[PDB]
Amino acid sequence: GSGNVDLVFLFDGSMSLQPDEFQKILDFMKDVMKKLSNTSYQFAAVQFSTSYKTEFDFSDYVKRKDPDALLKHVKHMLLLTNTFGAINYVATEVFREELGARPDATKVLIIITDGEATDSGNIDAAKDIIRYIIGIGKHFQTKESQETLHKFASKPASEFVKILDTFEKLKDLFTELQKKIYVI
Ligand SMILES: CC[C@H](C)C(=O)O[C@H]1C[C@@H](C)C=C2C=C[C@H](C)[C@H](CC[C@@H]3C[C@@H](O)CC(=O)O3)[C@H]21
Ligand SMILES: [Mg+2]
């Protein structure tokens, strides 16, 4: 339709993440934004743990644009992993016209986490958002834990759930993303 994509990074700041691992999440987000600067994509980023913080809104991105400056002042929260609550927060408190969301854009949520959710609920309010979940590291070693992530993602899980055994594999994920960039 409009050809516009409003994309939110929803990233884990729980106590499980070591300092260097948290930085690699931030570096990955910055790589994606830099590669897609000056396009029809708009970005916002939200850190979640026990509660949620909008690190920058869509309007901040449009005004400042520099991914380095925009994520420079992120404080690691180091609490729990309330992923149900975080998704509902994005759907009702971030995707809003008064915060710079474009009303007819395609909405996309990229969830990066290194643990199973410590809450529960439903995400019906977020169901018109395209949802990718990237699950990283040892807490997703087993098949049963990988499957807990299906609930958050759009369907099929085979396209929308990405499991990475280490944080260094975020770089491989960015290599694969770039092979899919086209001028249309
Ligand atoms: C696309 C390949 C990479 C690895 C990936 O999954 O990136 C996904 C997940 C993550 C790595 C980053 C993304 C950044 C931008 C877009 C939204 C991308 C998904 C792209 C697809 C493209 C078509 O299938 C239509 C659509 O709506 O989503 C995601
Ligand atoms: Mg966690």
UniProtKB/Swiss-Prot annotation:
Domain of life: Eukaryota
Subcellular location: Cell membrane
Residues with attached carbohydrate: 38
Modification note: In resting T-cells, up to 40% of surface ITGAL is constitutively phosphorylated. Phosphorylation causes conformational changes needed for ligand binding and is necessary for activation by some physiological agents.
Annotated ranges, domain VWFA: 6-177
Tissue distribution of the protein: Leukocytes.
Function: Integrin ITGAL/ITGB2 is a receptor for ICAM1, ICAM2, ICAM3 and ICAM4. Integrin ITGAL/ITGB2 is a receptor for F11R. Integrin ITGAL/ITGB2 is a receptor for the secreted form of ubiquitin-like protein ISG15; the interaction is mediated by ITGAL. Involved in a variety of immune phenomena including leukocyte-endothelial cell interaction, cytotoxic T-cell mediated killing, and antibody dependent killing by granulocytes and monocytes. Contributes to natural killer cell cytotoxicity. Involved in leukocyte adhesion and transmigration of leukocytes including T-cells and neutrophils.
Domain notes: The integrin I-domain (insert) is a VWFA domain. Integrins with I-domains do not undergo protease cleavage. The I-domain is necessary and sufficient for interaction with ICAM1 and F11R.
Family: Belongs to the integrin alpha chain family.
Complexes and interactors: Heterodimer of an alpha and a beta subunit. The ITGAL alpha subunit associates with the ITGB2 beta subunit. Interacts with THBD. Interacts with CD226.
Protein name: Integrin alpha-L
Gene source species: Homo sapiens (Human)
